[PDB]
Amino acid sequence: MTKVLDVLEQFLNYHGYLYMRLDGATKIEDRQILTERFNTDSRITVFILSSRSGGLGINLTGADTVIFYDSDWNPAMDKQCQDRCHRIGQTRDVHIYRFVSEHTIESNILKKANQKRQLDNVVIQE
Amino acid sequence: MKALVEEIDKKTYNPDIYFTSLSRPVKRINYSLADLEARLYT
Amino acid sequence: KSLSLIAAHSHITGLGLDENLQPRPTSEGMVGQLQARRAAGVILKMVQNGTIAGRAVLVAGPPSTGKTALAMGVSQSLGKDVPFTAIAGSEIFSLELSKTEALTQAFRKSIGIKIKEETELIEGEVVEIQIDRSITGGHKQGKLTIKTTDMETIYELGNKMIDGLTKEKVLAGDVISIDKASGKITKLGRSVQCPEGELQKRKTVVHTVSLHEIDVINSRTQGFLALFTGDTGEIRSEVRDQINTKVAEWKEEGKAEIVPGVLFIDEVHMLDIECFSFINRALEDEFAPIVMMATNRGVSKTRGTNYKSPHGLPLDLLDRSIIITTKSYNEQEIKTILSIRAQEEEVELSSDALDLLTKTGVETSLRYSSNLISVAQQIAMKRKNNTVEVEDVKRAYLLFLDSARSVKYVQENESQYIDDQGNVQISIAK
Amino acid sequence: NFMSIVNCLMQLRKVCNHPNLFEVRPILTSFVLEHCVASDYKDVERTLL
Amino acid sequence: VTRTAAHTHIKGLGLDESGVAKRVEGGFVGQIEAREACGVIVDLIKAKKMSGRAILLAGGPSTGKTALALAISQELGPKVPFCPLVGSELYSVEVKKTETLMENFRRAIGLRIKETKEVYEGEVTELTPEDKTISHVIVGLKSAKGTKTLRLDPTIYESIQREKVSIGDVIYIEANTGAVKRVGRSDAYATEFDLETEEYVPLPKGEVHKKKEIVQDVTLHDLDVANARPQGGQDVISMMGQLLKPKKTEITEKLRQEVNKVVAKYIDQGVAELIPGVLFIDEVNMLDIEIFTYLNKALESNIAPVVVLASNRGMTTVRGTEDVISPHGVPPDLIDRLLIVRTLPYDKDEIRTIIERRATVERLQVESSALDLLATMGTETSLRYALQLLAPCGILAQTSNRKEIVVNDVNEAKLLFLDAKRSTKILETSANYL
């Protein structure tokens, strides 16, 4: 959801990093420029994106790390997100993390997907 | 108790004037000709 | 109203009496105590008469026998509109106030005064209120329409009246009561209420104010705050000497009357000798409440002196007081009292359990069994049965020890408990 | 339904990540009690004065 | 990580639904009768019917009186107010002991209310004085989703002037209490100056006026202090008013009765619910007779919550009394209204289980032999000493890199640290007063 993006910008702005956001609220002219700006060597540590908008077809080789706050579907759709990072132009190993809470719905999702070998999920009840 | 905050419109409200207001009822109307002509000619 | 859960005296209400002052065997939560109820009733009618003031009476008796319940039934039988003051003996001792002034403050609190005032008030629904800004013709022009069921008229406001209507926001259609002499507005609800009748009516307003409340206001800029905050801090005696004369003139003019309230002091045996010496002088004055004092102890040492006076009070105070003695309860009264507490606490007791509870009440104490009657209801509640059973009373008897049993246990276990000399053994062996 | 399940889980997913649930934390202002018992005795003070 | 001081291994009484106490539950061994009679008291407090009831528990040192009195507070839950108190605290220099004793009874009964508060927020557009008397001010607060103007009181205007607010600065105003807060200058003015010390905050999202309700609970005494004395406010007259009489004062019975009446009128609307509580007094043997005799009259009151007392003594003289000797340092007249819960000392096996569970909660591994030594210790010296030596043995095990306690370590701890019986023996034979 896009309501996490502004809070994340107020956070990254609180800790004072260099970031660029790409989502459905941007234009087409500021997209490729914010892309090439991240791919080329620069001081930007974190690059914020969205699942549907910029997490699908882009080329970015710059980042060595992928972070997932929340994942609804990950047979495929979420696999594309970290595959946006790992590309042909990456000589460094990709460390992909995941954020899972404790004793929550997200904690039950991967626990039910580990026993069933992660095919597809239907109903979460526990 | 007394409200320390009061909502006010710029155009409608004025500190000068304060106004409050709430078989078949009919407002009394005088049918006299000399009364109406007397009112309009004063 | 007045949310209260359960009190020890919550059952007894207003003692009990007949027109012959002869007490009934069971009247209004009061069992037992025949003579004591008659004497306390004589004192009650003495207070209601009000011809005599500044008299002391003593209530003596064994612990847990017919003592505090007496004064409670006298206070409840006296009813509202008459002052009643109950203070513990340890409460008059204060770090901020002296013992003498704190002792006089109760004597001033126990006597009230009723003041009446007549006012002309106009109340009713306001349908339409018009208010106009200042013009050269007049300072302010406004007309408010006060509608009532019987009569509806329009008044033209008085300037500062308009400042009172504009001062607090008033919306048309609410029921208010405007005070002409006071100059303030009182809103009784919205139109929640209905107009009763004619707009303007002459009524009298009676105010019951104690001598203390009159005394504190004059000694301070704002004394009514000093009433609630307890910062009063030793009002001058000159002010009180003026209050007494002003009250006398108010009585001669007929603008006020005095009510001879009652002052009850629990735990008088712990009062200091200085307070005992002041009470003797405080009783002989003109305005003093009727004083009732109750002491459980007797033939003990008065606080502040080495010698032991009888009953724990000085004989000079005993001369001014009349003594009432209470007697220990018989076996047949204890079961009726425990039955009254059973009806008060919503506890159902079988006759077989009432016999054991009565026997334990005679063997140990009444206060104990009356504590157990409350505890057994939960043990019965776990069994889900609505009525208490003998087995539950026995379980409640073994779970919670008595005092006499606990002493006999301590005497054998004394080696385990700490001693006056400070010796204790926490090691099991050797 | 199948819609009530998703719309019911979107509130938990609107919590775990961040308290996005309407995110109202009370400012903890003091209590509003208007009685001021002394004001009830103010009139008695006026009459006695 | 987790701090543990003589506690936290007790999660409650651990009673079943029938009231029977298990041998081992929630860090409790033995003491079945005391846990049962304590749970009966728990249900009595949950019943709310009884009032002014007093139950004291008398037992030797280390017998677990206080540790059992914490379990009932854990069993009642955080919603029920609990007031731990020590008998030595009732002596106060500022106020008399009697007032400090009566106050706690009012602190022990919690009352939860519910009330709605109005909130206004937005960027200020215009500020004008309407100017004897301080005139009002019209405020132009601009919400993101709308624009509304509101007239303000002169006092809240004074608070506004003291906050140095200016046109185009986001502010926060509370309706009921009249509190004023400024979040900062609006984000749109951030480009006015290149270097400035004032931070920029975004425009508040949503409407100017906002509402909500709070379940906030306030103890009855905390409500009484409000009526008794003034409290902080942003106006100067408030600060001077609270600074006029900072010292606490004794409350008259009249104000208390009136506050009780408005509490009743609050419970008539269904807005609030009155719930009782538990007052716990440690070392009641330290109380003067003047507090006991006042406890005689105070417990007879209907508003007095259930109180629990704890004292360890034999037959002793009551403090402040010359010739009076009564059990547990309590007067005989006060003991009548009290119900007694007796405590028993533990055997060797129960000491061993205590040291075991305390070692598990302390997160430390103990071998069987050193555990038996700790049991023999616990029998020959005291129960508290065996629980006391646990940590130093673990420290010596850290110095020896061992992950478990050994007999040599607990013996070395016996050599380095001494209990009371050895120190008294050194005290009997010494040169100058060791």
Ligand SMILES: Nc1ncnc2c1ncn2[C@@H]1O[C@H](COP(=O)(O)OP(=O)(O)O)[C@@H](O)[C@H]1O
């Ligand atoms: N005449 C009576 N009728 C009913 N209950 C009584 C009577 N006398 C004493 N009690 C009981 O005794 C308890 C308190 O005893 P109390 O009169 O305070 O003894 P004391 O005043 O000597 O301390 C009350 O709970 C009350 O129920």
Ligand SMILES: Nc1ncnc2c1ncn2[C@@H]1O[C@H](COP(=O)(O)OP(=O)(O)O)[C@@H](O)[C@H]1O
């Ligand atoms: N039944 C029990 N189970 C576990 N630990 C206990 C038990 N009884 C007492 N203790 C322990 O003994 C220690 C001291 O007991 P304490 O209650 O302070 O004794 P006292 O009541 O004499 O002051 C407490 O830290 C507590 O953990």
Ligand SMILES: [Mg+2]
């Ligand atoms: Mg492609």
Ligand SMILES: [Mg+2]
């Ligand atoms: Mg008594």
Ligand SMILES: [Mg+2]
């Ligand atoms: Mg004399």
Ligand SMILES: [Mg+2]
């Ligand atoms: Mg203790």
